[PDB]
Structure 1
Amino acid sequence: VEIPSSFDSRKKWPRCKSIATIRDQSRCGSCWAFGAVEAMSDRSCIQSGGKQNVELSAVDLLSCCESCGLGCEGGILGPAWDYWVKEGIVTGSSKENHAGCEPYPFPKCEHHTKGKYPPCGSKIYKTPRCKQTCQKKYKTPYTQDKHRGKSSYNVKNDEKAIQKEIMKYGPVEAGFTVYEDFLNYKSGIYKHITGETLGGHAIRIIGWGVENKAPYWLIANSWNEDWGENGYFRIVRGRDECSIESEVTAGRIN
């Protein structure tokens, strides 16, 4: 099929409320789990024609997936998607909304940027326990609130393949390398210019575009709406900038 010059999942599937929802991972290294549950929420809705229209629980995945790494100390994408396929993930909103089976336990904070939330600072919460219990007001038992995928996979390090995957099946999770200058991002199309590595980060790629001839990916971060472009950023597309085309993972419900 023909790939359009720009694509935005928010515009293609606006009935799916997760797609335009920016989350905050708080003072926990759970980016891996956020990019996962965000894209899983999106795809559950997209691929079911809107029948599933839920916010999947970051804390269920973060706390209960044993094979996914080190919890609030960082994690691994492939096993996060395997967990969704095999065990599934329950529902759960942000702390402040406290909806669904297992809402997130940690409050919004600023991630190296200015705004209306307390600064995140440098300290990290301990990984929450795997409690397997919906909040008192939610009247579905934990195991019966699970949402499962059918398959999970890595996407080829090929720009066109990634575009086709997003436009047919919905937003994807992706890893990339964080350099110090990324923490100064306010707006625009990011590329690494200054600073040393801070390791990686995991995010949700929702589309692409071009401005002033410069191609980009359009990405949701998990650092709240004050960060970047109302929670989003753009990064150079087509040159594997910061490995953005090389660590893409997603999955399907059918």
Structure 2
Amino acid sequence: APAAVDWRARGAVTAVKDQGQCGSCWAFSAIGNVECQWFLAGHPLTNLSEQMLVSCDKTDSGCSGGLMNNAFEWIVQENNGAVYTEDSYPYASGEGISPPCTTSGHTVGATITGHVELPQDEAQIAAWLAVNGPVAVAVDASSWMTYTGGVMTSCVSEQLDHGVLLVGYNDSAAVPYWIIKNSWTTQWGEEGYIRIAKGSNQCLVKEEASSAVVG
């Protein structure tokens, strides 16, 4: 595998969002993966809607939280693969309250037909990520609210609590690292991102990794 990857530099990744006081990070993770799998599929960079997931995906629990695998599953099964634009199903859950489901007013912004579930193996996750792009990942973010910058190397890693996006890594570095999109504003972390150490299952990042498949 290449010694370093950052899918952002190829412009594959959308602007860093804001989930609000709402445990909708599973939605932000998933949607971010979709935005990226849809870009790389030859299509233009389009902002997609987490609100669709939060309000409509009943297989998960809205502002109370959820899984990404279920998000993907639901999109493909109940929503026939269709994911709406963000502009036409905008986020209205910045206050821990999620609007009910609406079925008119929107516009389809992407298609996925399934998703894949990655080996609990950091290196394969990495290789794959080099070949196919950004990966939704579940993580322990317990030590994260105190992260200002750098390669965090002392992660509490015991229970998975968060949903974020792997956009790349680096292996040449002194401390090898992952490169991670967060849905807490760009005013958090490294302009909305965090790097953690690659190689030790920091934050249980090798655990639940998956990605929507566009085509």
Query: TM-score, normalising length from structure 2?
Result: 0.90
Residue 200 of structure 1 corresponds to: 161
Q: CA deviation at 1:211?
A: 6.7
Q: 1:105 aligns with which of 82, 92, 101?
A: 92
From 63, 72, 90, give the equivalent of 1:72: 63
Correspondence 1:237 to 2:208:
no
The residue aligned with 2:119 is 156
The corresponding residue for 2:17 is 23
Q: How big is each residue's C-alpha offset from its partner over 1:114-152, in whole Å with a ceiling of 9 and x where there is no partner? A: xxxxxxxxxx52222111232xxxxxxx3x526321221
Partner of residue 53 from structure 2, selected from 42, 61, 81: 61
Percent identical residues: 27
* 2:175 is equivalent to residue 184 of structure 1: no
Distance 1:39 1:133 in 2: 25
Distance apart, 1:4 and its partner CA: 1.1
Q: 1:171 is matched with which residue?
A: 134
SS in structure 2 at match of 1:81: helix
Q: 161-170 or 227-236: which moved more?
A: 161-170
Give the match for residue 127 of structure 1.
98
Which sections of structure 1, spanning at least 5 residues, go unmatched? 93-99, 108-123, 135-141
Q: Aligned AA for 2:5? A: F
For residues 7 and 91 of structure 1, do their structure 2 counterparts lie closer, same or farther at Cα, with a shift above 3 Å needed? same
Question: How far is 1:219 from its partner?
Answer: 0.3
Distance 1:159 1:193 in 2: 16
Taking a change above 3 Å as real, the CA distance of residues 198 and 156 of structure 1, as seen in their structure-2 partners, is closer
TM-score (ref. length: structure 1): 0.77
The residue type paired with residue 92 of structure 2 is: P
Question: Which amino acid is the alignment partner of residue 65 of structure 2?
Answer: G
Q: Any runs of at least 4 consecutive aligned residues in structure 1 with deviations exceeding 4 A, and if so which?
A: 196-199
Encode CA deviations 1:46-84: one digit per residue, 9 max, x unaligned. 02x2x24311101011111111x2110111121111123
Count of residues paired in the alignment: 212
The aligned amino acid for 2:164 is: I
- 3-state SS of the aligned residue for 1:72? helix
Please point out which of 214, 218, 223 is paired with 2:184.
223
Bigger Rg, which one = 1
The answer to whether structure 1 residue 82 and structure 2 residue 45 are counterparts is no
Q: Quick one: distance in 2 between partners of 1:197 and 1:239? A: 13
Could you tell me which runs of 5 or more consecutive residues in structure 2 were left unpaired when the two chains were aligned: none
Specify whether residues 155 and 199 from structure 1 end up closer, same or farther in structure 2 by C-alpha distance, changes over 3 A only.
closer
